Amino acid sequence: MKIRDLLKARRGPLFSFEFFPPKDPEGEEALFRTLEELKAFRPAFVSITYGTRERSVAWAQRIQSLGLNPLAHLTVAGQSRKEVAEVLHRFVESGVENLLALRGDPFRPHPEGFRYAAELVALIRERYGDRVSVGGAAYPEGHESLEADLRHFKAKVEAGLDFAITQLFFNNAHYFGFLERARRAGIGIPILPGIMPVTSYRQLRRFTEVCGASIPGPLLAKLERHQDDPKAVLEIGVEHAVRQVAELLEAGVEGVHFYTLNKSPATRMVLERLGLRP
Amino acid sequence: MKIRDLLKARRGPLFSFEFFPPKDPEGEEALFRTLEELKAFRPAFVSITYTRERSVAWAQRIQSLGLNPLAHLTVAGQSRKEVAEVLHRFVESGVENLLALRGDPPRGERVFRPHPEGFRYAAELVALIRERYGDRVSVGGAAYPEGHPESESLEADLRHFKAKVEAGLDFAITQLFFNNAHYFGFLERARRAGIGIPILPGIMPVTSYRQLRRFTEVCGASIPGPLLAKLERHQDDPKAVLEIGVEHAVRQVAELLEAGVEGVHFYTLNKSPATRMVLERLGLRPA
Ligand SMILES: Cc1cc2nc3c(=O)[nH]c(=O)nc-3n(C[C@H](O)[C@H](O)[C@H](O)COP(=O)(O)OP(=O)(O)OC[C@H]3O[C@@H](n4cnc5c(N)ncnc54)[C@H](O)[C@@H]3O)c2cc1C
C-alpha cells in the first residue's frame, strides 16, 4: 500500500522502522529474522538505509516477500542521473510503491549527477506521477538559517512530496517548532517525527557533529555522568525516547519513524513501555 | 501598530497581557499604575477583558500610556447596531487591534442565547469589521486547542475555526491551556486544514484551587493529572498553590519559546504577581 493512503486511512498512529546495511552475511540473516519478529508490532513500513545499489533492490524484494511494506531509500550522491533513474526503475519494477528521495551525505555532486533531493522527487513524478508515494527528509534543527532551510523544504515539497520523515531529534520542542515554520509556510503534508533512542555514549559525537541533533541539558548530564556504564546509557536513552513519543502521540502526530540499530531492541522497548505492542 | 504588522516583522516572540475590569476606582488607578510600570517591558499589546462605554475609555487610557491596546469586542447580549456603535467608538479612538469574540452567557448562566437582533458567531463580527473597516484594523479571534465546551467534536470545532479565519482573521489567541501537547496538536490539526495565520498561545498560571472549576467547565481546559494531584493536595495553602501554578507556567512557556511560538499571551488577574513571577524566572524581567 502507498504510504500516502496508509496515512489518510487514519487507523491510529503509524509506526515505521529504519534499519542499517548489515555488516556481514550472518548479520543480514539476523536483520531479516528481526523483520519477521517485527510483524508483532504491525509496522506500517520498513526500510534499510541506502549506501549497495543492487543489494538494496534485493532487500526491497526480500521485505516484500515477508509481507512487509518496503520504503526504498534512494540518494543522488556519487551517481549519474542515468544510474539513479536505473535504480529507480529497478525498485518500481520489483513492486516498490514507496520511495524516500534523499541527497546523500557528501556536498559535491557526481559530475553527471543531481545536486538536490528535489531533483530526484521531480524525476520520480515525471516518470511515475501518482503511481508511487514519495517522501523526503525534514531537518527540524536545520543545518545557513532555519528560515533558508524551510524555503529549501518548501521547494522539495512542491517538487511532489506526499510526506516527510524527520532527522532524529531528542528535544520535541525543535520538532514542534519545525512543524510551526511549515504551517506558516503553507505546508500541509504529513511530517512524521524520526526517533533514535541513545543506546551508547559513542553515538553522541555522530548525533551532534554529523546529524546536527542537539542533546537537551537534562539528557546530556544523565548520559555523561553514567558515560562508563553501558546498561545505564541504554536505560537513559529508552526512558528519554518513551517520554518524547508519549508527548508526540498526545500532540496528535500521524506516526513515529524509529531508527533501529539492527541488534538493538531499544525501539521495541519504547513501544512496549508505552503499551503499544498489539 | 497593527498586530498583523508586528507579527510579519518577525523580531522574536510578541509578549502580550490581558487584565480584568477593575472592581472600584482605587483598583482602576492601581491597574493603570501597573500598566505604566509594564511599558518598560515593551509588551507587544495589552488588553482589559470586555460596561461597553468603560471598555472604550480603558482602550483610550492604554493608548495615553504609549501602550498598544487590543480591544475585546463581543456580540453577546447586544444588538447588531449596538455592537457596530461600540466597534466605531474603538476605531475612532485610534484602536487598530480588535479581538472579535462571541462572549460568554451572563453571570451564573451556562447556555448561550443570542440577543434577538444580535450576532450569533464571532465570525459574523469579523465579517462586519472587514466590510466596514477593511485593513484599517487588524482582527484576531479566540482559538480552542481542546475545543469549545459547546462544540460536538474537535473536527467540527476546527471547521468553525477555519470559517472564522476565512471571515478575515489576521491572527488568533488560544484559550488558556495547561498541557502543551494539546496546543501543539491543535496547531497540527490547523496545519492539516491549511490554516497559516499566526496562533498565539494563551497562558494563565493557576493562582487558586477555586479557579479549576472555571477552567475545566467554562474555559474547557483539561488539567494534567500530575498538576491536578498537586493542586488537590495543597487546596488551602495559597502560597504553595501560587508556587505550583507559577512553576507549571514557567515549564509550559519555556517549551513554547523553544518551539519558536510567535508570542505568548498572559491572562493576568489585576492584583496577581503570578505573571511577573513567571517572567522573572524565564529571565524576561529582573528579579
Ligand atoms: C483570547 C480570548 C479572549 C477572550 N476575551 C473575552 C472577553 O473579553 N469577554 C468575554 O465575555 N469573553 C471573552 N472570551 C471568551 C469567549 O468569548 C468565550 O469562550 C465564548 O464562549 C466563545 O467566544 P468565541 O469568539 O470563540 O466564539 P465563536 O467563534 O462564535 O464560537 C462559539 C461556538 O459556535 C460554534 N460555531 C462557530 N461558527 C459556527 C457556525 N457557522 N455554525 C455553527 N456553529 C458555529 C463554535 O464551534 C463554538 O462552539 C475570550 C476568549 C479568548 C480565547
The reported resolution of this PDB entry, expressed in Å, is 1.9
Helix axis angle for B238-258 and B274-281, nearest 10°, is 50
CA atoms within 13 A on the CB side of A271: 24
Q: Which residue of A has its CA nearest to B7?
A: A184
Instruction: Compute the CA torsion angle A189, A172, B243, B108 (nearest 10 deg).
Output: 20
Residue type, A62: R
- Å between B189 CA and nearest CA of chain A: 8
What gap in Å lies between CA B136 and CA B139, rounded to an integer? Answer: 10
Distance, CA of B148 to chain centre:
14
- If residue A235 lies in a helix (H) or strand (E), which one and from where to where? helix A230-250
User: From the CB of residue A229, how many other CB atoms can be counted at a distance below 10 Å?
Assistant: 12
- Cell 472600584 appears where? B24
Name the phi and psi angles at A134, rounded to 5: -125, 125
What is the number of other CB atoms lying within 10 angstroms of the CB of residue B210?
A: 10
Question: In chain A, what's the furthest Cα-to-Cα distance?
Answer: 53
Residue with cell 534485493: A58
Break positions in chain A: residue before each gap, C to N over 2.5 angstroms: 51, 106, 143
> Which amino acid would we find at residue A131?
R
Q: Cα separation of B140 and B72, whole Å? A: 9
Beta bridge partners of B73: B100
Angstrom distance (rounded) from CA B62 to CA B19: 12
Tell me the three cell numbers of residue A93.
519494477
Q: Phi/psi of residue A3, each to 5°?
A: -60, -35
Measured CA to CA, the distance from residue B211 to residue B202 in angstroms comes to 16
Q: Would the CA dihedral through A123, A125, A127, A131 be positive or negative?
A: positive
Pairing of strands A14-19, A45-48: parallel
Residues 6+ apart with CB under 8 A from A264: A197, A199
Which helix (H) or strand (E) element contains residue A259? strand A255-259
Residue B287 lies in a domain: no
Q: From CA B198, how far away is CA B5, in angstroms rounded?
A: 11
User: Bridge-partner residues for B165, per DSSP?
Assistant: none
Which candidate, B45, B92, B89, B49, places its Cα nearest to that of B67?
Answer: B45
Active site residue B18: yes
> Is the distance from CB of A47 to CB of A70 less than 8 angstroms?
yes
CA distances from A168 to A57, A212, A213, B192, B258 (A): 25, 9, 7, 22, 17
Return d(Cα A167, Cα A191) in angstroms, integer.
11
Edge-to-edge order in the sheet of strand B263-267: B45-48, B14-19, B263-267, B199-203, B171-176, B138-143, B97-100, B71-73
Nearest C-alpha neighbor of A271 from the set B178, A262, A260? A260
Q: How many distinct structural domains can be found in chain A?
A: 1
Element (H, E) at B15: strand B14-19
**Contact assessment for residue A238 and residue A273, using Cβ atoms and an 8 Å cutoff:** yes
Tell me the C-alpha distance between A138 and A167, whole Å: 6
Asked whether the beta carbons of A47 and A15 are under 8 A apart, the reply is no
Residues belonging to chain B: 287
Q: How many Å lie between the centroid of ligand 1 and the Cα of residue B156? A: 14
d(CA B105, CA B76): 7
CB A196 within 8 A of CB A168: yes
Crossing angle for the helix pair A172-184 and A146-158, to the nearest 10 degrees:
60
- A14: cell is 503509524
Q: Are B197 and B218 in contact (CB under 8 A)?
A: no
Cα(B61)–Cα(A76) distance, rounded to whole angstroms? Answer: 62
* Interfacial residues of A (vs B; Cβ cutoff 8 Å): 171-174, 176-177, 179-188, 247, 250-253
Residues within a 6 A CB radius of ligand 1: B 49-50, 72, 74, 99, 101-104, 121-123, 141-142, 148, 150-151, 157, 160, 163-164, 173, 175, 202
Residues of B in contact with A183 (CB under 8 A): 187, 190-191, 195-196
Q: Of B120, B45, B44, B131, which Cα lies nearest the Cα of B87? A: B131
Rounded CA gap, A83 and A53, in Å? Answer: 9
Tell me, what CATH number does A258's domain have?
A: 3.20.20.220
All three cell numbers of B135, joined, read: 485593513
C-beta contacts of A24-30 below 8 A and 24+ residues apart: A27/A262, A30/A262, A30/A263
- Identify how the structure was determined: X-ray
Q: Which residues of B are annotated as a binding site?
A: 50, 72, 102-104, 121-122, 144, 148, 151, 157, 160, 164
Residue B45: what are its φ and ψ, rounded to 5°? -165, 165
State the SS3 of B118-173. Answer: CCCCHHHHHHHHHHHHHHHCEEEEEECCCCCCCCCCHHHHHHHHHHHHHCCCCEEE
**Range of the structural domain that residue A201 is part of:** 3-274
Question: For residue B186, what is the nearest residue in chain A, using CA coordinates?
Answer: A251
For every residue of B264-275, which 3-state class applies, written as one string?
A: EEEECCCCCCHH
**Contact assignment for A181 to B260 by CB distance below 8 Å:** yes
Nearest to B260 among A171, A180, A188 (CB): A180
Residue with cell 506516526: A255
